Swiss-Prot record, chains A, B, C, D, E, F, G, H, I, J:
Pfam family, one: Phage_endo_I
Keyword Membrane: no
InterPro entries reported for this sequence: Phage_T7_Gp3_endoDNaseI (IPR008029), Restrct_endonuc-II-like (IPR011335)
GO BP term, pick one: symbiont-mediated suppression of host gene expression
Name recorded for this polypeptide: Endonuclease I
Alphabetical list of CDD domains matching this protein: Endonuclease_I
Annotated source species: Escherichia phage T7
Enzyme class: hydrolase
Length: 132, 132, 132, 132, 132, 132, 132, 132, 132, 132
């Protein structure tokens, strides 16, 4: 390279004992791959609401939930738990419920609340969805 | 499913007509992949300063220089441009130099400032480094 | 309620003439009201980069962009301004470009940079998109 | 468009095989979608102070409050918590009260302070309100 | 006052020549009176949109507009100007238009844009309004 | 009206059926009235320190003390409480002292700290002050 | 003191060659003087508005203005610049106008707006003010 | 000024009965003074660290430490209290320890941690200091 | 130098009794050493996760962790606390758990979650890592 | 530790082939060193102010001024350049003047402002200084 070379020459002219393309700096490049996936709620109420029954709620499941929320604010996806009191990880002070309150997720225990069922209808962008 | 069953039965008991796992919600998983690579500075001065000559500076090149600054603070890496007055893109008001200034990247034009070569020697962690 | 009755009790005893749940405060919210829309970028490069040529870029087209970004992080969308030098509005110290830089939106001026065109190809989830 | 045609021109000449306005990005917004609602505080004192006795105060009843505030700055609404000591959610360093203080919401515990009752009377725009 | 007196005595006991309720500190107390008022748009389009014709646009008029926006986000009130180019105050660099863009107000010159008229209908809370 | 007329005629020309100034939008004008008053500290020590005794500390009292701190920084005003351990409201975790600490209000209990009385004399702007 | 002795024996018990209360670290403690001062606005219209004409307006005069603003919120003081277009200082993307806009300072260009002069009179706390 | 003249002239032609420089606004600007004060750590460890033991930690001394950190960043001064638990003041919801963490001050309880004792030496500018 | 001479004559031309290049203001310039270091995680599961057990965990160990995090983003390092319930430090409203939650650090209590152990393996950059 | 032991035990019973303290993570913590350096203002005005004239203002010296401000807040050091317009560096969109305003440094062009010359005296700690 002209510039690269002109520079080495500059160093050589001053009798500078430098090192040429000898050392390498190890670093890790974080690529962000976006893999596209699908998530199917368990029940779709007539009023447009979506309900997901969940017994055990893994970290994957949670994150994925949150992703679905960020990317699709037009959807109402709520979770019915067997025990909203269950703790995220054994020994942890945080439950499925709390974590739900935190990121504002509507949830309930054992059965879909009558309130939810009786809620005023809202359009669901089916065209945006993919049926099974 | 257990809890699932119960829910669906609840729904049927109230005669609510619902859709059972009919639709899938598409979403993309923002995966952060971390691949790893090496960066080889052009010259290593006797005082410990690493210098990279650079005619044309690309986008990748920039990000890359930035990852390294974060992942390797101990290392002193500087750029020497054919022209720091060059723009990142056609019509772009922002220039190489402005950019490096904006990120704390010491740089210069055409040749290595004698001042650089005169700065007091500093240690270099050859251990953390690999060779060619 | 218990707290409610306690509170109404203290007041009653104290002889505080007061009104219980008599008035309703007319208020409004847009919480669960997301109307589905579409945004057709101007160009789609093979490597997958979307380009949106914009003359005037008002404060609303800005909101829409940040919006579409959050909802579609899997897509690469940049802007070719007629002038990134333009201020958010006459009377602002900030320009279109500076906005884009702060918000990490890739942009160019008048024409689509060659660098962009020569970037390494990445996938595009056409399913998640509707074709005119 | 001119900019649009210029951009498509450069690309055409350069031989860049590209797609012009072919795909639409399904996105969503709640911009102009405000559903009208009502909030009935629990008590209305003669001096005009509204009091809302609240046991559990979740992260949503919070949003509604700040909301109703902005929209009705002319009204005086305070909260009698069963416990302002409660944290926003188990796992938070912040409590109900501290939230209220930061956001400038007047609050008491268990009972309506006498001080409140004895404050100097101020008008109330009953027209702007619907009575149950 | 017991405490007040106990303190003076304390000062007297130490033969401290202090001054008693002699000086006053002048300060101004800013009361926030909320006067309730009304604002009548000039035209109400069938699609729920409100339009206000405006020739001259005083500071009062502006502020009031903004108030109406903050307090009633459920209403669509737009302004048709004779000259959106007119400057706020003579000599000023800011126009009715710019000020409009700034606070995101939809405006137009001389006539209601056909686009506006053709916009998709939206409910108007008449019950919330007061007719003339 | 002129521009008004034109608009309405435009509307009629397209046969659009509109409502002409039919409804008024109610809103409250947040007026900031600035009344002015005086504050009379209980004692003025020979060193320039103003002291206010205070058994029970009300809400008005607090705000008032705060206006003065802003409007009159030069003046050194301190409170002496019968009990700084007292709460602002029943059940309130927050106490007088905590409050003054939170706002930089030097205070003390029962009696004037001899340390105060011992602090070096500072000027007092009697000019800016009024007498009784 | 106890802690000192417990700490010095600990050191000594380990044979730590330390230095005991040997060196004095110098520094400078600061207090704040308050010089009473006065600012004479240029004009005082019949409605109360105080107008101050201004050509140059450096950071120094600006600060003093904001200061006066804090201490005297009850006063309406506007500025008539020879040119609000003049930047705060050479190089700044900001001007006197924008600065004032951001700080709530009501400003104008060349002459006192007819609008100001018409605004409905409001009382002035001449008590708080000193006459020339 | 020319601006002053012009402004009044326009005021005159319109016949506005204004007041020219007839009133002064009393405000108080505050100057800052400095005291040549001196501090004195308790112990001076071989590795440079200055350890100061502290029983009751007055907010005053708390200020000094803040100053010294700043004024002498070349010095390492840590604190060892009889209790890093003690609260800043009566009823204080904050402990000395919290204080030090908020400002980056290294502390310890009862005796000097061995980790500190073994910490690597670092020059101490005895010239910038004074001997007892 | 020119400016110096122009400035000194100006002073002299006014008869200003000033002092010329007489005093030297002392200060301390700082550089930053970089000591290469290493941290040995406690366990390394088959899927890549590095687990580090922890009882006490003071600000010092916390910082080091965050540091390691910055420099080595490609590494999954979690912590198993004896009790995440333990506050960062006495008095803090925060605990090890919440701290980690806020900082993205994946933590657990008492033992290594079965979930972690099941997570799908991911590559480790052993190049970047040194073996014991 | 007991925690370490327990964690591995559970790992063992489940039969997880893990690696105990088998890998070190190379990271680099950086220490901070200080140089006893000395600065020297150009002129020392009677009122205390130290005026330093400056032609080309290197970013290096820019750092020093920052340090000195901090390390010696008891001193007033201002700058007079041959141009407060000059840019920090080649292609720099920032002027020396801007620099000083961002850090609160008082500057002037060509000669020392008379305002400075007439500014009220303030002690100068000649003891904390050294003579040329």
């Amino acid at each position: 390279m002209g510039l690269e070379d002109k520079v080495s020459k500059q160093l050589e002219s001053k009798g500078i004992k430098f090192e040429y393309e000898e050392w390498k700096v190890p670093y890790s490049n974080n690529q962000q791959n976006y893999s596209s996936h699908t998530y199917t709620p368990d029940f779709l109420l007539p009023n447009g609401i979506f309900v997901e029954t969940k017994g055990l709620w893994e970290s994957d499941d949670r994150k994925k939930h949150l992703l679905i929320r960020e990317q699709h604010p037009e959807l109402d996806i709520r979770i019915v738990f067997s025990s909203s009191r269950t703790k995220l990880y054994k020994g942890s002070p945080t439950s499925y419920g709390e974590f739900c309150e935190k990121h504002g997720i509507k949830f309930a225990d054992k059965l879909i609340p009558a309130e939810w069922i009786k809620e005023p209808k809202k359009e669901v962008p089916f065209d945006r969805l993919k049926r099974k």
